From a paper:
Thiolation of uridine 34 in the anticodon loop of several tRNAs is conserved in the three domains of life and guarantees fidelity of protein translation. We thus propose that the same mechanism for [name]-[name] thiolation, mediated by a [4Fe-4S]-dependent enzyme, operates in archaea and eukaryotes.
The crystals belong to space group P212121 and contain two molecules in the asymmetric unit that form a dimer. The [4Fe-4S] cluster is chelated by three conserved cysteines only: Cys142, Cys145, and Cys233. Remarkably, while three Fe atoms are attached to the protein via these 3 cysteines, the fourth iron completes its coordination with a non-protein, exogenous ligand, as revealed by an electron density adjacent to that Fe atom. Based on the diffraction data at only one wavelength, it is not possible to distinguish between a water molecule, a hydrogenosulfide ion, a chloride ion or the oxygen atom of a sulfate molecule, which all could be refined with B-factors in the same range as those for the protein. Note that several sulfate ions originating from the crystallization solution were observed within the active site. A negatively charged ligand on the fourth iron atom is very likely, given its charge complementary with the [4Fe-4S]2+ cluster and its proximity with the guanidinium group of Arg149, located less than 3 Å away. Moreover, Lys135 in PhTtuA is replaced, in MmNcsA, by Arg149 that adopts two different conformations. In both molecules of the asymmetric unit, two loops (residues 130–137 and 275–280), for which there was no electron density, were not modelled. The propensity of the fourth non protein-bonded iron to bind a small molecule indicates that the [4Fe-4S] cluster likely plays a direct role as a Lewis acid in catalysis, specifically to bind, activate a HS− species and transfer it to the activated substrate, as proposed earlier for TtuA39.
Author numbering:
A (entry chain B): 1 to 129, 138 to 274, 280 to 311
B (entry chain A): 1 to 130, 137 to 275, 281 to 308
The structure:
């Protein structure tokens, strides 16, 4: 009686979903991942007369998200999909990673747009003499992607964050005790054409994203950062992993717990563009330390 | 340059506070622990014309908290301190635990009151017949209601509980991992309590290691008090998470707690025969009180 046949077709299985206790072959795993992503996005995102910008970085996540989104919008006529790669401009890596994303876009017919850090910002790599490097990079990338999505007049900005990436970030915000970082995430419903950040992979674990990348034979590139290595996220990932390894569905209950939390919690800027308040811009804080550069509003 | 002299007096040290990177001798550590507890309680708790009931269970925490509170209220003329021991009646050796707590109350002159679970309707002489849920949860929930009803009976202003920084960081993390917002809703709302006696935790910001070190220096005769009918492995797993986080990032337990304190201040704000209620449906928090036990007027 206790075998390993597929839950949907009773055929030999390739994946045992440790959370649910369900076995899935190649075909049934792809179908249930597509179903879960279709559920995550909803009918507001998956419909006609919709333009979706997507932040691609060459890794498994971006390419897996890019492939799934393309499969849906391929069978929708007036529903465009644009790919944005943001070249940080490092002497070490970054050059490799975007190459795998560009070659994917060519092979699958996705309109790509490579935008550089050394364009919107004057300095390509490091503001050496003081201030956090990995954070600075992520904050700017978000503002660049928002500005490119507005420029291309996109309805949504798709980001390849998986359930592990979200569970880690939630747990990090919990361990750090950040309520100010939790506050900025609060006002993210619908704002002045401020392109809505969608995460199609938000409920798919890293292992499933990786397994889906292997089965689709997607030529993804890891691209390790030569100027940033935060050991806290790798420590937090081990916490969430060991929690999942002892209690299946921990990562989901951690995330669902933050989703419920964010519901029950209660353009302003200078020169550039609105994000929260005028005061002294959080992005232009590092800009003030050097000198303000091109690309701004009226 | 790099020695080990005391941060407050420059004398050889007995404790290295791994989170602050500071060193304290016996006298300076006792003084900084007393200062932190004085800070946790405030002027409203540490003043004249108040009575403080305190849940004692015989362990280092309850005795350390009982000793500190007694030191303060000893010099305060019009302020009282009552100790309440709750024998759950769940057989085994709970008696040896209360024995250490009673013998402290005798040696230090604190008015003690031993109250039973069986005395407040039911039995619980191992009642679960064939902290998270079912046996361990039901015990903790009742204990709270018994302690509240003994404090009301003695007309106390506050109910002191021996929860330490480790105890508090773990519970917060458990509530985070479980994703409980309904259990988070119970905390707060009832901030303007009518009949409910205010639950104070003097040890709330003192880590378990400091509480234990303070117990050793004061030569307190505390009892181990182990449970023969409850062992929840999740809290022991969570404690290891909070410990390994502290061991790699000093002050993690405090930032986890301070993060929950800041969260609870910016968050969203029928029980027949007994009472409690306060924006809650059916038995409020009373696990059952129906069929298996009943017994009502
Ligand atoms: S790891 Fe590198 S590319 Fe990623 S946010 Fe940090 S600095 Fe930027
Ligand atoms: S460990 Fe034992 S005494 Fe403590 S709450 Fe659980 S059942 Fe009650
Ligand atoms: Zn199948
Ligand atoms: Zn700005
Ligand atoms: Zn000293
Ligand atoms: Zn009741």
């Amino acid at each position: 009686m206790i075998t390993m046949k597929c839950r949907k077709c009773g055929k030999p299985s390739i994946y045992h979903q440790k959370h649910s206790g369900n076995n899935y072959c190649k075909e049934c795993f792809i179908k249930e991942t597509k179903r879960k992503v279709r559920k995550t996005l909803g009918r507001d995102v998956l419909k006609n007369n919709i333009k979706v910008a997507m932040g691609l970085s060459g890794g498994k996540d971006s390419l897996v998200m890019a492939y799934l989104l393309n499969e849906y919008y391929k069978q929708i006529p007036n529903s465009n999909l644009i790919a944005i790669m943001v070249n940080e401009g490092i002497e070490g890596y970054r050059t490799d990673g975007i190459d795998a994303a560009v070659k994917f876009c060519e092979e699958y017919g996705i309109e790509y747009k490579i935008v550089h850090f050394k364009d919107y910002l004057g300095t390509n790599l490091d503001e050496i003499v003081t201030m956090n490097p990995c954070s600075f990079c992520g904050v700017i990338r978000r503002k660049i992607l928002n500005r490119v999505s507005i420029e291309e007049k996109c309805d949504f900005l798709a980001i390849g964050h998986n359930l592990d990436d979200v569970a880690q970030a939630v747990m990090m915000n919990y361990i750090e005790g950040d309520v100010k970082k939790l506050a900025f995430l609060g006002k993210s419903l619908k704002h002045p054409k401020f392109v809505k950040r969608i995460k199609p992979l938000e409920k798919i674990p890293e292992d499933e994203v990786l397994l889906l990348a292997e089965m689709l034979e997607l030529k993804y590139h890891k691209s390790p950062c030569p100027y940033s290595c935060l050991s806290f996220r790798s420590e937090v990932s081990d916490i969430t992993d060991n929690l999942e390894k002892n209690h299946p569905g921990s990562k989901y209950s951690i995330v669902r717990g933050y989703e419920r939390l964010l519901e029950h919690i209660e353009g302003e800027c200078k020169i550039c563009g609105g994000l929260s308040a005028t005061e002294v811009c959080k992005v232009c804080s590092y800009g003030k330390n050097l000198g303000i550069l091109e690309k701004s509003k009226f």
